[PDB]
Amino acid sequence: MNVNEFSNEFDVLYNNIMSNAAPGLNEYEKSVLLTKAQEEIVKNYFEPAGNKYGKGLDDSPKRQIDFSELIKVGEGVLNTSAPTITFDKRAKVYDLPADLFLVINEAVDTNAGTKQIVPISYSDYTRLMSRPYKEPVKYQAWRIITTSINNISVELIVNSNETITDYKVRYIRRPAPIITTNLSSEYGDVTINGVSTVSECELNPIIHSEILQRAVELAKAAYQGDLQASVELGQRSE
Amino acid sequence: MTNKEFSDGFSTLLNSFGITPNITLDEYEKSTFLTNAQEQLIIDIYSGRNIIYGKSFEQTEEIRRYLSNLVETYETSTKVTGKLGLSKDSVFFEIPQDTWFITYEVAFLKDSRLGCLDGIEASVVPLPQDDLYRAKDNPFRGPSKDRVLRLDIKSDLAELISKYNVDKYLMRYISQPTPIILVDLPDGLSINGVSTESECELNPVVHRAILERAVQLAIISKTQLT
């Protein structure tokens, strides 16, 4: 469903049927609420605990098809452009894509074959570097986030005498905003995430109704305006 | 089996990264447990203490085919000069320093006194120290033209007590096996002083028994406190 249909059905669900009808929302307000609902729905559905079903990214066909249109595969760029201070002497720094929302799978192709990257925690880092070996298992590599500016920088730790040829990253693309109308104005150009032009929902139509319902709920919570509504409907921001 | 096959079979037998509870090892841990299993197995085989086999060093064809690749022969004519022995006619010879157990040990003699028998090969008899005093004068078990007494002493030495001069000393021992190292280990690490990859030098017949014992040692290591 296109942006016109979002706005029309938003009006229908918000104030065209309600008894003591409230003031209609401006298109900037509707676009804001739709974008917020979009991010909220994505974050609810990625985490099993964030939604009532207890199901995460890949725990049912619906959850697969939800993010099917948001999955992207790219490559990390070796960060030898400038010098830097790595926490680990034997770690190669790589830069992830700018439009990165969540990492779900990583892999590195070395001279010794492909190796799955395991994102090790800081407590797991401390535990693993206390052992005599201090290297990953056969078919894996280790990863820790390093000094990041304007985009995520990543430290890859592979076994000794191994060189990395490429670093593929299956991530979830950052959702584009939903903007109903050209927000250009003579009084000042307003933007949702830096874009004022019309922007369609770049996700599957399976969750367009879901985003609309969340937008309506947020609109009515803002209308109520008490601390209670904001606190209870902020629990789902996550 | 090769090092790659060793690691892959180790993972398969341990059910690494399966759905059921399991154990995952680093290649260093795999190397450590494979080496421990190797050396335990060959020592138990040599001593005949393995209940599965229950046979000694060369007691059957199976054990021959297992430990055939550790049997090393050695020759030496040099004698260590400054040492204190238990008899005047005591000569000392160095050991190759990689020996595990001496299995054949013979000594050639060069002396004028045993005329026309010169260059006689002589059986080195390992003799305990209890028997030494009462074996020095023994004409049936003591030193003679066809028999030499060897006593082990410090610094990897062999004190050969003979009535005649000893010219050459021949050995056939079991050697240190090369460790089973599946990866070039980082700096500092080593197994038996070896840092690079090291393939098992025994026959493939015993490689799978070594793998089974290494797997059992791994489960014991992870499941000795639970």
With an 8 Å Cβ cutoff, are A135 and B186 in contact? yes
Distance of CA A22 to the CA centre of its chain: 33
With an 8 Å Cβ cutoff, are B184 and A160 in contact? yes
Count how many pairs of residues, chain A against chain B, have C-beta atoms within 8 Å.
Answer: 29
Chain B contact present for A89, CB below 8 A: no
The residue with tokens 């280790």 is A142
* Method of structure determination: cryo-EM
Contact A80, A173 (CB under 8 A): no
For B164-184, b/e burial (b = at least 16 CB within 10 A) is bebeebebebbbbbbbbbbbe
Contact B38, B199 (CB under 8 A): no
Out of B7, B24, B183, whose CB is closest to A159?
B183
Residues 6 or more apart whose Cβ sits within 8 Å of residue A235 = none
Q: Which residue of B has its CA nearest to A141?
A: B26
Dist CA A159 CA A140 (whole Å): 9
- Tell me the shortest Cα–Cα distance from A133 to chain B, in angstroms: 6
Question: Which residues of B are less than 8 Å from A133 in CB distance?
Answer: 26-29, 185-186, 189
Q: What are phi and psi of A206, to 5 degrees?
A: -65, -30
Structural tokens at position A211: 């985003």
Neighbours of B195 (CB within 10 A): 14
Edge to edge, what strands does the sheet with A113-119 contain?
A71-75, A164-173, A100-110, A113-119, A140-145, A153-157, A92-95, A77-78
Chain B contact present for A134, CB below 8 A: yes
Structural tokens at position A186: 């003579």
Q: With CA atoms as reference, report the closest residue to A208 among A69, A18, A19, A23.
A: A69
Contact A132, B186 (CB under 8 A): no
Dist CA B188 CA B124 (whole Å): 42
Dist CA A62 CA A68 (whole Å): 10
Distance of CA A13 to the CA centre of its chain: 27
Dist CA A100 CA A74 (whole Å): 10
Contact A119, A99 (CB under 8 A): no
Dist CA A3 CA A211 (whole Å): 12
Residues 6 or more apart whose Cβ sits within 8 Å of residue A132 = B28, B189
DSSP string computed for chain B = --HHHHHHHHHHHHTTT-SSS-----HHHHHHHHHHHHHHHHHHHHHT--TTT---TTSSHHHHHHHGGGEEEEEE---B-S---SSTTEEEEE--S-EEEEEEEEEEE--SSSTT--SEEEEEEE--STTHHHHHS-TTTSSBTTEEEEEEETTTEEEEE-SS-EEEEEEEEEEPPPP-B-S---TT--BTTB-S-B---S-TTTHHHHHHHHHHHHHHHHTS--
Question: Which residues of A are less than 8 Å from B183 in CB distance?
Answer: 159
Structural tokens at position A139: 């078919």
Dist CA A238 CA A187 (whole Å): 35
Chain A contact present for B24, CB below 8 A: yes
Neighbours of A94 (CB within 10 A): 24
- Tell me the shortest Cα–Cα distance from B209 to chain A, in angstroms: 23
Neighbours of B48 (CB within 10 A): 13
Resolution in A: 4.4
Residues 6 or more apart whose Cβ sits within 8 Å of residue B36 = B214, B217
With an 8 Å Cβ cutoff, are B7 and A137 in contact? no
Dist CA A11 CA B137 (whole Å): 120
DSSP string computed for A177-189 = P-B-S----TT--
- Residue of B5, B183, B197, B221 to mutate when probing chain A, most A C-beta within 10 A: B183
Chain A contact present for B7, CB below 8 A: yes
